[PDB]
Each structure stands twice: as structure tokens, then as C-alpha cells.
């Protein structure tokens, strides 16, 4: 016999202060008992388990479909935490094309990785005897059991340590481990490739691990995690949008899931209106009618998804480019590619929940998201193509009160273009009328007043019902904007309104803020000055609006 | 040569912090660095039985092209038991000049306690999540961990004993992996003394705190005041009245009586001039009841003033500033707001280390996603402070300009 190299065991402990499992065995039928006796006898002959005496106080239930199924849920609850088998799902657009990709079944190695000797006693299980007239057959595992918490991590780490020298001494090949399958890609000739496959089978045989010689079951196109992986391209598995006379909640969740999934390769997918119908819904079974916007969006999606689209694999010798387009209502779409018309992948970004916003902040956030995704998938930041002029961005970040930065990018003339819709003056405007604004409201009756007095003697006070102090301050500024010329100075004491306007929104939840924004767009020059309230600053008339 | 027992705080498990994505060049840099460290026994590979994690990334220090490994031990540092202490040298900030030296390599000569090593686990990530990462743990005192200077303190005293016995006029402070050496000599004599100390440490950053002072509140001096000038003056004085008690604005607010054009010149009355002068005299005095409490956090606020100018304040209680400043240095960041902010954070943190011996909690005028996306690209310091984000524009910005 050729000596087999031993696989180093991983030391395993239980969670602190906890003991091993002690679950009572369910009574089984005589047939199931016989089946489990045969299966366990074969496994004992193979070395996966061993018989133990009565001094082992631990026990884990065992079932039959025959096939043996040990329910390790209690031991899993009591087992220590391990390092994750994966910190994320690989994305197909990061894969590098290979002339050959071979699949090897290392499933038989799963039962060949030994379990920590001091931990085997916790895996004990009992086969019930016929008619329960003899003691049940006591077994314990010697290898990583299927279903135990630590089996995938210990198996993957053991396999990695085994493959490390082979991968190191063969840098011209790529070996990936996924579950009980190894994937070996290379650009070598098919003969040299199959040769190095045989060398890998020998190196694995040095640890007694057996690779099936007969032809495998997996072959292009690889179906994996909702993806189709082809020799030269990748895509998502076929996305079919169902025809429904009426849509329930789970149909809209299935639809938004299919559209989100498809949006990574199909460009222009929108999900705003369909996701909006799931607002504040608690029932999975409720039927919700479709808005007209949801119908138009769904039709656009059906037109985008009418024929297949494929992404290309990554080529590290070419540049990485990411282009963004604004879609409207806080929606953005983007394409990542290296050659024109050949996308690596696509995606979308929706604006965050907020009371006020503008297009520049959203484009910034989308750029950061794409930067992070691109560092994940490819380990580098792409060059950006953005629908915003260089001078627009320069004005923005030079005048914005926050620090902000976008990495290397170039302007692409694809409407709608992101622009600044208004810019407030830095100094008071000579010759422009000065509007002193103020508003106030009663906390009990919700009655208020908003208005202005100007240096030319112009005045206005408007009474308001169902209002607040903040609303009357905004309404006062709005009245000043309505009644002034193209250039106007505006004096307020509202720290609230100044906090809003200085954030430079172009869209808001408040219709009043949106009206103020439209007025600001219509103006040529607006200087907004703040003063402390109740300080006797004349012009600032608190009493005129508190009557 | 002998390990000292180290443990965590009661009831606290080790750190389990996600490793953030890294560029390919930083990953390869970490692969070379960690391979060399593994050859030297400083770190060892670990198996799946270690569930803890602390993030790692790679930087490039000043005047150097070699990559450097930087571990974000913040969570482990707050989870590590308190070590004990030495009172902070109040005379370090009073010295004329201070020089910062990186003495981190020395920590690698002292082995780390066995049962604690697993808490120093870190991961070199893989591109596209192809592998669970290359996992390591430290065998010696790691750089950036608060226990390293506490454990090495005796050895550091033994090494610095001859130098401190030779020059009693030089102040020596240690914070993390940095040694701050303050004196009053000439720049040339200070540099030769620094080479003397580095060759003294070899066998076994100019900074001038004397050129730094607290910034008083200043008011304009004008011969003609417009309505707008007076309104801004009253606003600033009203803000300052929260810091100084006897600030008075009613005589200056009298001039604003009436609905006048913003650009209209208003002459100051005699009562207004007297009130403004009294306010000036009040502002020339220090703030009443300002003290430092070592049990409270330090808070640092930063405002972007534009044109590469940044203001900052360090306080513990509102309106009780312990330090104020204005960083306007221009060093290869004229077109990058985030790089400027990161450099300002590093300088303010250094000043806070010199003054109080601990790092402040920052309030950054930046969105979370931008900062967290980009700050590691411009970080050059061994330590890392804490920060939160300001999403609403503060009105007091122009009152610090
Ligand atoms: C191993 C792994 O983590 N994944 C996600 C995985 C990768 C696959 O592709 C692969 C493996 C090794 C080397 C190179 C590549 O892919 C390069 C691009 N490419 C893909 C397919 C092809 O035919 N030719 C190529 O050049 C594959 C194929 C997988 C398949 C399955 C399944 N079933 C699961 C995971 C992976």
C-alpha cells in the first residue's frame, strides 16, 4: 500500500459555558431501523463512524429519508463560531476568460477529512433497537458530518491547504474551490491542460482523495446561482415577466425580484413604481391595483427584456469604464464595460430616503456605489462617464459647504444633463429690493401669518390656517420670491429655512419647498441673509405676523 | 522574551469586524508584506476555528514609496482591558519644537501572549470574493494595538534611560507607535539631536507647538457700515453671547430700526460705538470656566471655509472650546476636498495627542458614503480616531471665518 499523507485536523471547541447535545431519539419503524443498521454498518466498515460504549452521555437524533439523516441542529446551536466559507458571492463579470475550464468532483473527500478527536464524542447518535428490547447501537463520527456547523469551513480550509503547493508551482493555471467541486481554468493547449488536470488528480491522490475518472455531469453552459456562464460570455438565467390580470403582493415581490436580478445585465431596468406599491404593506396575500405609472414602467421593462443580452468577461489589460444616466424620480442607471457596446455588467441606483435632495448629490452617491462595487469585483476604480459638465461640477464642489469628491471622470453629452438650478449670491445685491420676511403660528389653533415689508414700502401679510411656525417662515420667503423682481435681497430669522435652502435642494417632499425652488429657478440673483430674531432688528417685523 | 498575560474586558468577546474591499495593488502589497512578516515569525496563518477579525489596509507614508501595512485595531482597542497610568506631560505642548518618530518595529521584538493572539486575526481579502481570504494572526506585539506601548513601556524606559539622563531639558512622550520628542533647540541642532536619538535607538516630522495659540473672536473694523455689515455683526455678537456673558447688541440693533436697503450705509451712533468697543474688550478675555476633564471625550468639529481653508474647534462641553484653529496648508490636494479633510483630521488628531494624550471624536462635514469610500486613500498615520457625520449645514461656519 502506498502511504497516504494525513490531513491535519482543525481543533474545535463548544461555545463557552455550554455542554454537548443530549436529544432524545425518536422511535423509528422496524424497516427504517434495518435500513439505518445496514447504512451505518457500511459506513463503519468505511471508517466514517465508530461504535462507542455507554459512557458517552451525548446523543443526536437520526432519521431515514434509504438514506441516513442526522439532525445536528442542537450541536450546531452549541458549536463555536467559525470563519465564514465566503465573504460574498462572486460575480461573473469579474471572471477572466480561459481557453479551458475543467470540473472535478471532490465529493468523496468530504468524508475523508478527519474530525477533531476531542470533539468526536459530541457527534454521538443512537440507532433504536428492534422493539426496543436491546440497547440501541451507539455510534460517533470520525469525519466531518454532513449538516454539522463546521463541516464546510473545515473542508474548504483543508482543501485549500492541500491545493496551495499545486497552485503555487503552477501559476499558469487557475484553481477555484466551490462546495465539493474544483474548477481548473487555463489558456494552455488542450493536451497540456488535460495533462495538468491529471497532475492535479495525482497530487490529490497523495492524500488519498479520489477524483471520478468517468466524464462529469457539469458542462457549458454552467448554471449557477441564477447565472449562465458560457465559454465567452455570461448572462442571467432567462427572466420571464408573467402575464397577470391582477397582481397580488407576492406577484409584485416576485416581479421586483426578477427585475432587480435582471438589472445587472439588462440596461435601463426601473423598479420605482412597482416597489412603490409595496409601501407599508403587511400582508403577503393582499391584492393591490396597478397604477398607470406602474403599467408604463412594466411595459418599458417588457420591451427591455424582450431579447437576450449577455455580458463579457473581464480583461485586465483593458481599461474599466462606467457610464451613468439619469432616469428620473431619483432613478439612475449605469453600464460598466471595457469595449464600447460590450458591457461587463449594468446596474441601477435609487435615491435614499430624505426630505430634500438634488441631482448632484444623487449622482455623487451613485458614483461612490459603483466605485465600491467595482473595487469588489475587479479590484480597481473605473473611469467614469457622467452627464454633467466639468464647470457645473467645479462650481458645485467649490461652493458646497460639505467636502465632496468624485474620482477621474469625463463629461458625456447624454441628456438629461445634471445641472445647478440656482446659485445664491455671496454679497447683497446693489439696487435690488430688500424683503424682510417673517411668519408665525399659534400652537393651539394652528392659525398663522406670513409676510414681508420692503425698503420701498411694499408690504404683505397673509393669514393661514392649519400651519406651523416653520411652514409660515417658508411661506414668508415664498411670498417674497413671488412679489419681487428678477433680483432680490431677502432677510429672514428662520434658522430652519436657512438650513433647508443652504443644503441646495432641487426637489423636496414639501410642496412649499418645491414652490420656493421654482421661484428661485426663475430669478436672476437672490441674496439670502439671516438675522437673529427678537433682537429689535428693524424691518424684521415679528409683531406684524403675530397679530 | 517573556510573555505578559493579556485578556479582554469581562463579558466581551473578541472583535468581529468586516474587512472592507481593497484595490488589487493594496492586496498585492499586503501579500508581499505579510509573506515577509510570516518568514520572520511576526505573524502566522490560522485556520477556520478563528472567527475574529480586524480590518487591514495599506498606505504609503510621507517621503516614501514603500507600502506599509495598517491595521484598524479600533474595535480591539476598545475591547481590550485597560492597562495601567503615567500622567500626560503638560509641558510637551509648551515646548518650542516636537519631533514624531515611528518606533513601531521595536514592538515586533516582544512576543505576544499565547491565548490572546487569536484576537489579533486579520484577513487579506480576495478580489471578487473568490476565496474567504488569507487569514493571519500576530505572534508579537502588533502595531496599532493599545496593549503594545503598555507592554513595551518598561523596555522603552530601559532604552531611553541614558538619553533622558543626558538631556533633562528634552521631553519625551509615547503614544501608540509614535515617540514625541520636544525641546527648545535650533532646527539644525534639533535635527542632529534627532539623528542622535535614532542612532541611539538603532543599536538596541517637524512640529512647532510654540507657533500655535488659541484664536479669539474678532469683529470688523470699518469706517462705513452697511445694513448688511451691521446685521452680520449682530448675528456674530449674538452667537458670541452664548460664550461670553456680558455681550450687548441692543444699541447696534437700534441702528437696524426701519426697513432699509441691505447695501445702505448707516453711520454708527456714539452708543453703538461704545457698545461695540465694550464687546471688543469682552472678547479679548478668555472664556470663563474652561477646564479639561480626562473622564470625558474630546470633540473636534471641522468647517470647510473654501479655497483650501478649514476651521476647527476642540471642546468637551458646548461653547467651552479647549482649542481652536485654522488649517489652510496646501500639500498636493488643491483639487480634492476629501484629501484635504483627511489631512486636517490627521493634523488635528496629532495636536490633540500632544496636548491631551488622546484622540478626539470628529464631526465631519461630509456624507458617510463619500468619506468611508475615500479616506483610506489619503491616510498616513498609525492611529485612527472616531468620527460621525454632519448632514445639516451649521450656521456658525461664517462666524469662524
Ligand atoms: C469557482 C467559483 O467561485 N465560481 C463562482 C465559479 C467560477 C467558474 O468559472 C471559472 C472557474 C475557474 C477558472 C475560470 C472560470 O471562469 C472564467 C470565465 N469562464 C467561464 C466559463 C467558461 O466556460 N469559460 C470561461 O473562460 C465556473 C464555471 C463556475 C461554475 C459553477 C457551476 N455549476 C459554480 C461556480 C463557478
Give descriptors for this structure:
heterodimer, A: 547 residues, alpha+beta, HIV Type 1 Reverse Transcriptase, Chain A, domain 1, Alpha-Beta Plaits, 12 helices, 23 strands, 28% helix, 21% strand, B: 401 residues, five-stranded mixed β-sheet, four-stranded antiparallel β-sheet, Reverse transcriptase/ribonuclease H (chain A), transferase/hydrolase/inhibitor, Polymerase, reverse transcriptase, HIV
Describe the protein in words.
The complex is a heterodimer of chains A (547) and B (401). Chain A is an alpha+beta fold and 547 residues long. Chain A folds into five domains: 1-85 and 111-151, HIV Type 1 Reverse Transcriptase, subunit A, domain 1 (HIV Type 1 Reverse Transcriptase, Chain A, domain 1), CATH 3.10.10.10; 86-110 and 152-220, Reverse transcriptase/Diguanylate cyclase domain (Alpha-Beta Plaits, 2-Layer Sandwich), CATH 3.30.70.270; 221-314, 2-Layer Sandwich (Alpha-Beta Plaits); 315-421, Reverse transcriptase/Diguanylate cyclase domain (Alpha-Beta Plaits), CATH 3.30.70; 422-547, 2-Layer Sandwich (Nucleotidyltransferase, domain 5), CATH 3.30.420.10. Chain A has twelve helices and 23 strands. In chain A, strand 18 and strand 19 form a beta hairpin. In chain A, helix 10 packs parallel to helix 12 (511-522). With 401 residues, chain B is an alpha+beta fold. Chain B has four domains: 5-90 and 116-156, Roll (HIV Type 1 Reverse Transcriptase, Chain A, domain 1), CATH 3.10.10.10; 91-115 and 157-206, Alpha-Beta Plaits (2-Layer Sandwich), CATH 3.30.70.270; 207-292, Alpha-Beta Plaits (2-Layer Sandwich), CATH 3.30.70.270; 293-401, 2-Layer Sandwich (Alpha-Beta Plaits). Chain B is built from eleven helices and 16 strands. In chain B, a hairpin with a 2-residue loop joins strand 13 (309-317) and strand 14. Chain B is elongated and about 80 Å long. At the A-B interface, helix 3, helix 8, helix 9, strand 18 and helix 11 of A face helix 7, helix 8, helix 10 and helix 11 of B. The site of the ligand *CC(=O)N(C)c1cc(Oc2ccccc2OCCn2ccc(=O)[nH]c2=O)c(C)c2cc(C#N)ccc12 has 19 residues of chain A, from strand 7, strand 8 and strand 9. The ligand *CC(=O)N(C)c1cc(Oc2ccccc2OCCn2ccc(=O)[nH]c2=O)c(C)c2cc(C#N)ccc12 is lined by residues 90, 95-98, 101, 174, 176, 178, 183, 185, 218, 220, 222, 224, 229-231, 313 of chain A. It is classed as transferase/hydrolase/inhibitor. The entry lists the keywords Polymerase, reverse transcriptase, HIV, non-nucleoside inhibitor, transferase, HYDROLASE-INHIBITOR complex, TRANSFERASE-HYDROLASE-INHIBITOR complex. The assembly is dimeric.
Amino acid at each position: 500500500m502506498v502511504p497516504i499523507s494525513p490531513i491535519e485536523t482543525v481543533p474545535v471547541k463548544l461555545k463557552p459555558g455550554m455542554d454537548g447535545p443530549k436529544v432524545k431519539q425518536w422511535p423509528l419503524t422496524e424497516e427504517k431501523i434495518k435500513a439505518l443498521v445496514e447504512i451505518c454498518t457500511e459506513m463503519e466498515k468505511e471508517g466514517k463512524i465508530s461504535k462507542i460504549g455507554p459512557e458517552n452521555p451525548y446523543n443526536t437524533p437520526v432519521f431515514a429519508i434509504w438514506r441516513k439523516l442526522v439532525d445536528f441542529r442542537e450541536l450546531n446551536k452549541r458549536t463555536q463560531d467559525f470563519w465564514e466559507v465566503q465573504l460574498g458571492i462572486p460575480h461573473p463579470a469579474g471572471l477572466k476568460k480561459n481557453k479551458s475550464v475543467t470540473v472535478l468532483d471532490v465529493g468523496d473527500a468530504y468524508f475523508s477529512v478527519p474530525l477533531d478527536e476531542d470533539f468526536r464524542k459530541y457527534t454521538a447518535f443512537t440507532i433504536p433497537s428492534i422493539n426496543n428490547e436491546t440497547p440501541g447501537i451507539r455510534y460517533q463520527y470520525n469525519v466531518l458530518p454532513q449538516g454539522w456547523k463546521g463541516s464546510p469551513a473545515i473542508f474548504q480550509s483543508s482543501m485549500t491547504k492541500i491545493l496551495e503547493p499545486f497552485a503555487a508551482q503552477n501559476p499558469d493555471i487557475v484553481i477555484c474551490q466551490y462546495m465539493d467541486d474544483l474548477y481548473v481554468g487555463s489558456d494552455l493547449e488542450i493536451g497540456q491542460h488535460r495533462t495538468k488536470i491529471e497532475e492535479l488528480r495525482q497530487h490529490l491522490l497523495r492524500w488519498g482523495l479520489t477524483t471520478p475518472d468517468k466524464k462529469h455531469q457539469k458542462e457549458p453552459p454552467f448554471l449557477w446561482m441564477g447565472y449562465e456562464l458560457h465559454p465567452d460570455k455570461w448572462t442571467v438565467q432567462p427572466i420571464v415577466l408573467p402575464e397577470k390580470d391582477s397582481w397580488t403582493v407576492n406577484d409584485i415581490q416576485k416581479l421586483v425580484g426578477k427585475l432587480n436580478w435582471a438589472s445587472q445585465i439588462y440596461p435601463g431596468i426601473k423598479v420605482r413604481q412597482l416597489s412603490k406599491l409595496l409601501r407599508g404593506t403587511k400582508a403577503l396575500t393582499e391584492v393591490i391595483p396597478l397604477t398607470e405609472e406602474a403599467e408604463l414602467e412594466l411595459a418599458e421593462n417588457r420591451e427591455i427584456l424582450k431579447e437576450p443580452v449577455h455580458g463579457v468577461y473581464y480583461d485586465p489589460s483593458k481599461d474599466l469604464i462606467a457610464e451613468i444616466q439619469k432616469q428620473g424620480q431619483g432613478q439612475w442607471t449605469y453600464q460598466i464595460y471595457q469595449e464600447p457596446f460590450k458591457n461587463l455588467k449594468t446596474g441601477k441606483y435609487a435615491r435614499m430616503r430624505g426630505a430634500h435632495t438634488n441631482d448632484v448629490k444623487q449622482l455623487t452617491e451613485a458614483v461612490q456605489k459603483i466605485t465600491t462595487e467595482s473595487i469588489v469585483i475587479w479590484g480597481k476604480t473605473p473611469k467614469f462617464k457622467l452627464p454633467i459638465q466639468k464647470e457645473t461640477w467645479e462650481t458645485w464642489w467649490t461652493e458646497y459647504w460639505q467636502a465632496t469628491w468624485i474620482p477621474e471622470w469625463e463629461f458625456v453629452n447624454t441628456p438629461p444633463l445634471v445641472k445647478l438650478w440656482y446659485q445664491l449670491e455671496k454679497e447683497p445685491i446693489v439696487g435690488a429690493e430688500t424683503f424682510y420676511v417673517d411668519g408665525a403660528a399659534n400652537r393651539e389653533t394652528k392659525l398663522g401669518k406670513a409676510g414681508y415689508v420692503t425698503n420701498k414700502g411694499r408690504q404683505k401679510v397673509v393669514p393661514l390656517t392649519n400651519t406651523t411656525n416653520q411652514k409660515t417662515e417658508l411661506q414668508a420667503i415664498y411670498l417674497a420670491l413671488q412679489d419681487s423682481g428678477l433680483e432680490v435681497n431677502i432677510v429672514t430669522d428662520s434658522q430652519y429655512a436657512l438650513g433647508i435652502i443652504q443644503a441646495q435642494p432641487d426637489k423636496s417632499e414639501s410642496e412649499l419647498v418645491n414652490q420656493i425652488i421654482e421661484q428661485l429657478i426663475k430669478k436672476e440673483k437672490v441674496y439670502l441673509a439671516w438675522v437673529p430674531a427678537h433682537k429689535g432688528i428693524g424691518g424684521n417685523e415679528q409683531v406684524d405676523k403675530l397679530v | 522574551i517573556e510573555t505578559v498575560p493579556v485578556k479582554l474586558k469581562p463579558g466581551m468577546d473578541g472583535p468581529k469586524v468586516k474587512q472592507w474591499p481593497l484595490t488589487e495593488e493594496k492586496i498585492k502589497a499586503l501579500v508581499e508584506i505579510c509573506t515577509e512578516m510570516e518568514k520572520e515569525g511576526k505573524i502566522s496563518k490560522i485556520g477556520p476555528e478563528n472567527p475574529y477579525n480586524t480590518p487591514v489596509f495599506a498606505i504609503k507614508k510621507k517621503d516614501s514609496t514603500k507600502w506599509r501595512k495598517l491595521v484598524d485595531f479600533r474595535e480591539l482597542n476598545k475591547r481590550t482591558q485597560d492597562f495601567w497610568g503615567i500622567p500626560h506631560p503638560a509641558g510637551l505642548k509648551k515646548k518650542k519644537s516636537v519631533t514624531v518618530l515611528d518606533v513601531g518595529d521595536a514592538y515586533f521584538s516582544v512576543p505576544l501572549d499565547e491565548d490572546f493572539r487569536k484576537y489579533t486575526a486579520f484577513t487579506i481579502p480576495s478580489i471578487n470574493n473568490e476565496t474567504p481570504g488569507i487569514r493571519y494572526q500576530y505572534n508579537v506585539l502588533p502595531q496599532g494595538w493599545k496593549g503594545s506601548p503598555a507592554i513595551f513601556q518598561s523596555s522603552m524606559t530601559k532604552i531611553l534611560e541614558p538619553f533622558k539622563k543626558q538631556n533633562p531639558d528634552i521631553v519625551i512622550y509615547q503614544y501608540m507607535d509614535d515617540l514625541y520628542v520636544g525641546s527648545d533647540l535650533e532646527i539644525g541642532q534639533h535635527r542632529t539631536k534627532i539623528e542622535e536619538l535614532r542612532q541611539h535607538l538603532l543599536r538596541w516630522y517637524e512640529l512647532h507647538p510654540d507657533k500655535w495659540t488659541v484664536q479669539p473672536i474678532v469683529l470688523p473694523e470699518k469706517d462705513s457700515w452697511t445694513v448688511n455689515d451691521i446685521q452680520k455683526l449682530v448675528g456674530k455678537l449674538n452667537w458670541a453671547s452664548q460664550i461670553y456673558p456680558g455681550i450687548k447688541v441692543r444699541q447696534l440693533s437700534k441702528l437696524l430700526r426701519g426697513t432699509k436697503a441691505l447695501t445702505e450705509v448707516i453711520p454708527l451712533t456714539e452708543e453703538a460705538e461704545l457698545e461695540l468697543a465694550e464687546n471688543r474688550e469682552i472678547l479679548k478675555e478668555p472664556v470663563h470656566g474652561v477646564y479639561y476633564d480626562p473622564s470625558k471625550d474630546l470633540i473636534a468639529e471641522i468647517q470647510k471655509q473654501g479655497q483650501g481653508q478649514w476651521t476647527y474647534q476642540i471642546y468637551q462641553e458646548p461653547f467651552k472650546n479647549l482649542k481652536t484653529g485654522k488649517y489652510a496648508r496646501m500639500r498636493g490636494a488643491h483639487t480634492n476636498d476629501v484629501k484635504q479633510l483627511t489631512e486636517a483630521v490627521q493634523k488635528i488628531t496629532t495636536e490633540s495627542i500632544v496636548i491631551w494624550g488622546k484622540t478626539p471624536k470628529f464631526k465631519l462635514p461630509i456624507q458617510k458614503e463619500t468619506w468611508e469610500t475615500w479616506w483610506t486613500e489619503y491616510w498616513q498615520a498609525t492611529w485612527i480616531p472616531e468620527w460621525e457625520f454632519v448632514n445639516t449645514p451649521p450656521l456658525v461656519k461664517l462666524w469662524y471665518q
